[model samples]
Target: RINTVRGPITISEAGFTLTHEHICGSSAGFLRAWPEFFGSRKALAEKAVRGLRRARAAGVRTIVDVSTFDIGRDVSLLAEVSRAADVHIVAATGLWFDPPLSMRLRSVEELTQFFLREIQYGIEDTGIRAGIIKVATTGKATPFQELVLKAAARASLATGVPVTTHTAASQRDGEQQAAIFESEGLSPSRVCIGHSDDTDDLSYLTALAARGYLIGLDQIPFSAIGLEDNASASALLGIRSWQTRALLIKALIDQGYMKQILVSNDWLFGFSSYVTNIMDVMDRVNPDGMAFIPLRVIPFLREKGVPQETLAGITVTNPARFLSPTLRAS
Candidate 1:
């Protein structure tokens, strides 16, 4: 058992967890298209029930939903979801990457106050807890992005929550994002620089790992714009093979940075229908060929001699460490 701000949660050792996901969310576009669906209490509750059941069946005991404010984050809905699911559900409290181009807006201090209040209420009152702080930039060192990072850093300090960031493709703003957080008195140990796989610079990830931050190499199974058909190609090629992915892990292990690497699917179920349909199209073209991409890639990684322990660490332990105390304790 581990004592969290949302009381105590206990778990067994064989649990797998996804550190980032969007279980359910409603953006401005969604609101406009389906106004009645925004914050529809019943729909949310039902989705939570179904999602948790699926996760548990898949051996995912915990999930961290990173859709924070300005993107239709609803902690209250998350709390209800947790209660209904009886699974460890962690929500986030922070802001998104882009700010609206509007006239009136809250100052950084004011936004920090609001985020802190949400963390306090979510952890102390709601049954669900916020286990991490979500922050992002547009992969550019814009002043607007800087302000949001500063506010998120402040909120993290106030709440003792670890931070995770959304870096753009190529991990362009990672260095700038790191500088901003460090300036605000945050340690790399308390941060995860996500989407490192989007970049070809392994040295950048290696350097970030040296600074004690977790490097995310999770955006596999997606297509890259103006490049290859799949995002995993560059990552797989950069590392050479599954053996290379393992060897890189071993190098990180030798450097004692094993704990600072993370991975994820970054998959959204609503968007999965397209992938499902794509597989159907592939099936029509080549009946004997694999219907899905992961089927080939995952097996290739397995057959090419990637260690199971390393895979488990990336898929389970690494995510668990940053997700919640309950998962960490187990």
Candidate 2:
């Protein structure tokens, strides 16, 4: 069975799963003081429901909200949105890009216990268990970040929930994180190296995939064409357009790594930095929101002669395998 926020469901029920996405993007530190920026729980839930419903209309059946507690992971809001949208939503446990001082103070053992509690029991006493563990690295894994990785690896080993990560693919940070996981005796297939579209380095991706890791080409929107300002996002993301990213994906598929690949548009419903309560970041930026994968990415691949079954492997069969606790444990 696959654990979703609404509760457990059979593995096949997790169809068309987006392995990485966020419902809200705010630090827990800012959430209490900045209710106006994020809106109330009721408002956020309603907005998420609306966005998710549109994704459902576009054929998205499941979404893995890889938002961590540090980044305002509200399991209550997750459960609410899942019920309202009729989407199988999987919540996550782990840290995001930056670690707060309080979190850093905890040792790997303590952090592992904390994450294990959330996975085995429930998050924040809400009785909504997380299905995955998420941890991140920007340029490289610092001492503390490595500690977080160790903690997450241990937790995944304990609970069999599997792991997803935010990686600086440009810096080849996933390689370093993978080394840490390897040392912990965690299987690479159980860990997804995320934001991989940031770099078009096929060799880098191939090396990870060759070692049995899941490559998350999850940042679909950031790789779009017109967003190329050259100095900011485009520079960071070496490959600029979805067309190019699509070709890269096609290359991996031809190289026999298709089953190891997962795709998603790391779309966020609400963000703390930019305050435009009147409009969502999804509509203003992506317009298609999370459905961009089906509505945009898939068609582009289809034109490139990628068959229905191949796309099915990437979107359907692959996610089911990666997410199934029974499969991961085996």
Candidate 3:
């Protein structure tokens, strides 16, 4: 059964799902400590429902909201939005970017057990259990980041949920991430290496899928992710585009990798920033979000001669198999 905010459901029910997507989240320190500090939950939750409903109108039946605990994962809020949008949402349990001091001090096993508790029980007594285990490496895993990856792997083993990852494609961080999971005796196919669309290197992508891992060309339309950190995004702006993403999908489909492919925008519905005037510093790039795929990419893929069946595999069937708790990595 796949754990959703609404409760466990058969994989078949998770139709036309966006494998990686966000309802709303932020990474500011204050938001991390107190998610509601930016404003009111009442207001934020309403906006979240509106964003999700926009996607729902586009034919997305479900979504895996990968906002980690550090990235402001409010499971109850997600649950509320899911109900309001009439969309199924799979909330995540894990850490994002750098580990805080509180998490940094914890031993690997301790971290593993903490994740297990959320998966086995419900998150913080809200009774909204996590549906996926997410881990991220910035460029590469620091020593502590490596340990966190291991703990996430071990926890995934205990709960039988698939592990999804945020890998720096430029640095080939997914390779290191897969190596660690292999060491833990986890099947590579049971894990997903996200942000892969950030690169157009077909060989690296093919090799990853060859090892039995799902490849996430998740960042479509290459939105303005560095809304807060503009300089960082500017440096990497040359890579990761929607045009290249479509071409890569065609190549993967040609190579018979549809079963191993998943697509999403990695989009965020709500956000916060440390610099109150940060938006003034930002260029008004419309960060392409959920609508790009079903509205644009699928039709683009069809025009490019990608079969309807293959499109279904990437957007629907692949996610169903990946989200299944009974699916073994091995």
Candidate 4:
């Protein structure tokens, strides 16, 4: 069984899963400080429930909420959204790219214990166990970030939860993270190289797939050709057009990598940022919300001649297969 926000469920119960997304997220403490942005916690959960219900109606039965505590995970809110939305949500235990000063003071072993507490026990007193270990690196894993990764691997190995990542794909950051996980003796099959669609390097993606890692072609409608990460733009490096990204998936499918790939939108219901009304801008840009993959991208892939079975493998079966063994390990 896999631990979800509501509780544990069998692998088959994790149907049509989105490997990456957030129910609600904000920079740490932003929600507490800026109540007006999210309204009440109940209001925030209600808004998320509305979006998730759309996803559920579109066939998204499970979602891996990768927002960590550092980024305002709000597991209680996640449980609320899960219950009200009537969708399974697998919460994460790990850190975002930036570690707080208090976290920086801990040893790698101590950090491992910190993550373990969330995975084995529960997050805070919520008794909501996390089903995945999440970690991130910007363009490179700094020494401290490397320690965090080591702790992530340690926690993952000790339990059977899978590890997913936030990578600066333009900088080939996933490669560095893979090296760290490999050095720690974590199986490549147990890790997902995230935001991989941000790169146009087919060979780079193919190599990771060949090495047994799950490739997260998430970030739909976000990545674009000739787009560079700048102050005006979010930290995302949009290196491939939507059509080009589809072609990348097709090429990988032809190369027999359909089983190694996963798709999602990385959508968030609510979040806090320095930019005013950022969620509104995000909604304007990606009006489909979490259903973008199943409703839009999948049909586009079908038009590209990607077989329905292959698309199903990418969207449904692959996510379950990738996450199933971790449940056994747990």
TM-score of 2: 0.92
Query: What TM-score against the true fold does each predicted structure earn?
Result: 0.71, 0.92, 0.90, 0.93
How does each model score on lDDT?
0.57, 0.83, 0.79, 0.83
Tell me the tens digit of each residue's lDDT in model 3 across 1-330.
899999998978899988788765566244446656546667667766776777788888999999877776778778888899899999888878745688888889889988888888888878888888899997868888888889888988887898899988878888999999999988776799998887768889999998899999887666444353566454433344567877787888899888899898776666653344222232244323576778888998899899898898788889988998854744
Model 2 CA deviation exceeding 4 Å by range: 223-239, 273-282, 326-330
lDDT of 1 by residue, 177-295 (tens): 89998999877766788766566566777788887777765544333323345444333223233333434444555556667776544543221212323333322322322111123
- Candidate 1 — which pairs collide? none
Give me the runs in candidate 1 sitting further than 4 Å from their true place. Answer: 1-14, 28-51, 80-86, 98-104, 123-128, 224-257, 270-300, 324-330
Minimum summed lDDT over a 10-residue window in model 2 is located at: 273-282
lDDT of 2 at 319: 90
Regions of candidate 3 where Cα sits further than 4 Å from its true position: 27-39, 223-239, 273-288, 327-330
Number of colliding residue pairs in model 4: 0
Across 57-163, the per-residue lDDT of candidate 4 in tens digits comes to 99899999999878778888889889988999999999886567888888899899999999999999999999988899889788888988999988988887889
lDDT of 2 by residue, 1-330 (tens): 778888898987888999999888778646567677656766777888998999999999999999898887778778878899999999999987656788889999989988998899989978989899999998878888898899999998887788999987879998899999999999998999998877878999999999989999987776424545534444533446666666777888989999899999888777774445423423555788898999999998899889989999999998988988842533
RMSD of 1: 6.6
